């Protein structure tokens, strides 16, 4: 058949240690208490990066033989359509591998095995209907509009000191988002100078380049251009520009690539400001913003052109000369500038912001929610341990081997926190059987306690597309027979 | 004391590997289609032996460094007074090891989790108790007698084939212990013949020797003579003394613990009195009990210092070579049972099988409590320590869940040996005990689930008790003991 | 998956091991006799590096694989905020790992050790203003201008022997300079000669390059003209390649397309009058010539960070291509001359018209340690800027730190103990100071951290470790004083970076992009 | 099907040699079962084709030794 064909035992154990090499190290990162972690390569690396979120690491290396990469790949999707939060889909598939060693003493097709999934299917919907996660998230909303999920996944980021601050900002500028607009003209910046605040909420777009050193510094009602035998030729390029440009009273030019040196004279004089080589995100998302225009040849200036006209000027924030383009008459698309002590952890909070922006679109329009901190996880596990008991025939087993997986996820949660894991599990246990949906680990408090209280809260849509890609990505692999990655090559 | 080093995570892998490697051999074991293991080892040991019971090999050997001979040591205490059913009790200590990765992980206190025996010594005793149990062996019990425990004692063993039937014998010896007698008097022997019975029960006690070709065959309302000095010593008047009184008792049998002089058979032979050469001591000492006894001493040993039961003894056909009966004893207390087999000298397994079965049956008479067989109390138990586990407060529970899913094992080793897949085994059962019906339980001949109550298969509820205690107390001294080095192993 | 995983302690002890090699070095480099290290290296790097101050040899170079480097990275920050005195700074963070062994008979999660440093922010807070400080320097000050810490940093460099005169001289300069802003217009440089004094103070910037021997000795109502592109021209837009041509004829035409390039400039120059040229990078020979026949001075690639400063002093120029002279550029007018007094001739910048900016010129020694001074300078000019800004300091030597540990004992106990069985590790980190401070003197570090404990304990904050003496004394009569802003920045960064290592063992995920 | 394969052989084979057409193999009962109830049947021409292909399979083997070429190294 070709090489590598780890149809059985010796294929199941290379499953099994990519599973726990991955489980120990996004452990920590969970929670409020999660944490911050950096690596050691050599080779086109350069240095130590810390990556708080699991999943952009995850894609970005492939170090050795053994699979992992492709359950991994997969992990992209869940954050593509959500996002993320708190770093535990994985953990849930990887922990499910160890009873694999149980079920060779089980010694039979694990596939009938695997009929357990589609029941695990069912504590996915089972659990949903039982777990009173949340009803609101009515729209923009008073102060539910955030100090809950952003805070949570921002938590596991060290910047959370003073970053959880502006993870409260983001959510205004979801709710502005929503609706009639599209996921449109939304970027974010960051600047040397810090204060307190860390952060101002700028009523327009954030660029940072100048025309050159001459020019006027500062323009008004300003028209915004939009751009996609030979000497003397060369001239008349020159003399094109001139003429178009008067009449309009044309303030500010934008290009989205390299500019001629020539009309760069005339613009000094003129008192036109320029832009080489505009970023195109930038100017697409500026366009919704100042009605646009259609980009064509030099013909473009006037009314093929639109442009808003309320304030462009190039001010001090406080160290670097940035260029402000403010006051937009649609109002529908915003942006947000940080700022935070100059620095490479400083980039770190541009890396949650965006994360940010992801979760609250999704809480909104998916109407639900879960309670985090692993209390749905231990309610849920609950549930699963009586069922197990129940079935007869070869279900029992899978069931029961199931049922134990939700044990860990607790587990997880309060090692991350330190506090020990033998008084926690129990502890915890106790009060989800109870009956208060609510309370939870918590990794603050160092035991348990409520979690509603917190704040924290799962977007829906993360809890059942895990648990039903974390089950299938388990059992993909025992089967495999020559695949991508697994171990021995 | 001691010597060698290995430090944290080294020195609990030396604890880890010790189990794993003893639960192989004995898993084969602990059911109907059991397998019988040999052992040969070099000079030091003299050859042959196999065997079937778990306790005897272990308690024998220390056949390497690592350490698993005190663990061993225990066992026989459990054995003494509650026995077997089948070895178990090491399987279940064994697989509490597993655990100790997740532990590495847990990375706090390795001790912390030992507060989890304690919860054993409830969730085990609680758990026997939320199951529904026998309520039967009423006294003597016709279909109740046997074709249970013994039946699953000897499951282990390769003898079940022809050996069920034995076993169902070995009740009708219980109840003859029954009262206030206790366990002890039952010796049973194997003869090389072949019967589809393959084994016979007889009223007294069972003695292999002849006096000579010659001699009456049998004796009536027989005297029994026992003396510690041998006939072994002119000549003519220690013969005189022997015949002139040995007429006067009426003398009809004389058993002697040692080499016996020639002219006194001559004698034997005409009087019409059977004597004994030989004899082992050790049946002496309980044929004494039976026969009430007497004072062992000089030629002076006749008449009244000697008491001698008087029903019959006689040498009786076994279906091979020759043996000797003795049987009709006034007090009652003492029987004997007679096995019989193929020749394999996988039949001194008959001998391990045996003392493990006879343990069983009186207790099961003293106790008048058991428990529900084939592994019938260890799935329900298992079905009710889940819950409790996260019924149960913080550091107590973690432990205790693992405890529960030790109970798990034994259904599938009970099944595994039988013949059978254990896989949809395991899983089947658990619905039927789940459901409320204790009685359910693993039927092996069936392959399936079946009623325990209609086999009648029962446990004694000591075996369940303490295995449970002893249990927890062992897998306790494992992970919490470092150094670990006494005599023997290590 | 998996990146360089040893299980445990071993992954603990490449933490433990990066902290304790690079004490050792840094341990030298603290104290009024300071040791200094020579490095020498093959592959790209000229001759040996000797630096005293210990945060630029290790921007300079990583050298291998254990992770200490972005420790090492963050302490630059440090420097531009206020920076140096003496490198304390990496050494206390080492220390820190030395009570690891503690924590493994700690039996708990690491973290929780962890919410200590939070805590140890509090701690080493509590220690500033806990221990008096100075009420500050009124302004210009008559004695205690200094004869202070930049002793101290300069008690670090071996040339103290007369250089300790010379930070003395510093002082002066920051005087004119002082907070209206954080700091501009500073330059200092050596010459080859030596003098009791070993250094003079000028009202203008002092600069070292020459045009050529010809040119006209003085020019007075001096323009001055910067170019950021270089004279020189040849390689265009398309080089042309590498030619060759029908043996001798055409090559001339490459010849006189360099004579238009020589035109511009005269022609342009003329008329303005231009005294002198600053170009910083390559000079082109060609306008050379003309500049002499002309009457003008230029200076061939001068340093970009002189320039820049010269440009507030000047006016400034706006630096485009050839269109460069008349109004676009402004040139202030006073004297540019070339004058020498001392040994290596150069030439000085007067009379500005913007008065904001002025320079000091170093002087003696001539050999490796004299090159030293022009970071040594630079250490002990960003120190005193933060002086007058912060309007607070605290006493040096030592002094801050002993004081700290005795409250921060207490703390461990005083506090609930998950929080208690760590503050007291933090607390036991500030001792190794006093001994860093002492080894390096030349006296006995066990003596010396004996004797230093009873004087700060009972309440004397201006006491300290005398290095000079061996024994304790007033630090206040030395002068020596450290600035607020070393100690509240270094405590948070502290904080932060040594023990969020000891949290993870051996970290995780990476090797991205 | 996830059922231990000696037990179905034996099982099987009864149900066959009774003389019951439509029974046959069932894997979700992981027994046997009637076939026809699930509305399992197989096309005529699979199953002649087959035999006489099968025998040309079996027609390969003990008389021919090694010889291994059909495409590039």
Redesign the interface.
């Known amino acids: 058949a070709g090489a590598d064909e780890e149809r059985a035992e010796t294929a199941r154990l290379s499953s099994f240690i990519?599973a726990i090499?991955?489980g120990?190290?996004?452990k920590?990162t969970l929670g409020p208490?999660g944490?911050?972690?950096?690596?050691?390569?050599?080779g086109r690396?350069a240095?130590?990066?810390?990556?708080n979120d699991?999943a952009?690491?995850?894609k970005?290396?492939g170090?050795?033989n053994?699979a992992?990469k492709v359950l991994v790949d997969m992990s992209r999707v869940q954050d593509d359509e959500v996002g993320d939060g708190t770093t535990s889909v994985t953990v849930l598939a990887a922990e499910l591998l160890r009873e694999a060693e149980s079920l060779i003493?089980?010694?039979?097709?694990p596939?009938?095995?695997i009929a357990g999934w589609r029941e695990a299917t069912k504590a996915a919907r089972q659990a949903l209907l039982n777990s009173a996660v949340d009803h609101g998230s009515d729209e923009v909303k008073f102060r539910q509009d955030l100090m809950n999920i952003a805070g949570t996944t921002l938590s596991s980021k060290?910047l959370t000191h003073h970053k959880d601050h502006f993870t409260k900002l983001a959510v205004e500028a979801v709710l502005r988002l929503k609706g009639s607009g599209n996921l449109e003209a939304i970027h974010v910046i960051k600047k040397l100078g810090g204060s307190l605040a860390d952060s101002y909420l700028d009523e327009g777009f954030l660029l940072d380049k100048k025309i050159?050193?001459?020019q006027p510094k500062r323009i008004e009602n300003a028209k915004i251009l939009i751009a996609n035998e030979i000497e003397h030729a060369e001239k008349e390029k020159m003399k094109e520009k001139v003429e178009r440009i008067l009449k309009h009273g044309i303030n500010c030019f934008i290009n989205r690539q390299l500019i001629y040196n020539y009309p760069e004279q005339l613009f000094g004089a003129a008192g036109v400001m320029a832009i080489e080589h505009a970023d195109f995100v930038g100017v697409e998302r500026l366009a919704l913003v100042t009605g646009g225009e259609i980009a064509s040849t030099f013909d473009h200036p006037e009314l093929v052109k639109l442009g808003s006209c309320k304030l462009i000027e190039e001010v001090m924030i406080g160290e670097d000369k940035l260029i402000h383009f403010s006051g937009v008459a649609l109002g529908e698309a915003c942006t947000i500038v940080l700022r935070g002590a100059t620095?490479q952890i400083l980039d770190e909070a541009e890396r949650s912001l965006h994360d940010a922006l992801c979760v609250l679109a999704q809480t909104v329009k998916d109407s639900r929610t879960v309670y985090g901190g692993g209390c749905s996880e231990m309610l849920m596990?609950?549930a699963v341990?009586?069922l197990?008991?129940?079935?007869?025939?070869?279900?029992?087993?899978?069931m029961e081997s199931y049922a134990?997986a939700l044990?860990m996820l607790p587990t997880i949660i309060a090692?991350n926190?330190?506090?020990?894991?033998?008084?926690?599990?129990?502890?915890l246990?106790?009060a989800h059987?109870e009956g208060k949906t609510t309370a939870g680990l918590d990794m603050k408090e160092?035991t348990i306690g409520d979690m509603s209280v917190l704040g924290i809260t799962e977007s829906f849509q993360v809890k059942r597309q895990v648990l039903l890609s974390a089950a299938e990505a388990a059992e993909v692999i025992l089967r495999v027979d020559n695949i991508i990655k697994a171990a021995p090559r």
């Open positions: 990519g090499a991955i120990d190290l996004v920590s208490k944490m911050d972690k950096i690596l050691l390569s050599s690396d240095s130590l990066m810390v990556t699991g952009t690491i995850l970005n290396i170090v050795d053994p992992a003493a089980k010694k039979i097709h596939q009938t095995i060290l050159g050193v001459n620095q596990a609950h341990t009586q197990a008991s129940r079935t007869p025939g070869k279900e029992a087993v899978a134990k044990r090692d926190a330190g506090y020990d894991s033998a008084d926690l599990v129990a502890q246990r106790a059987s160092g």
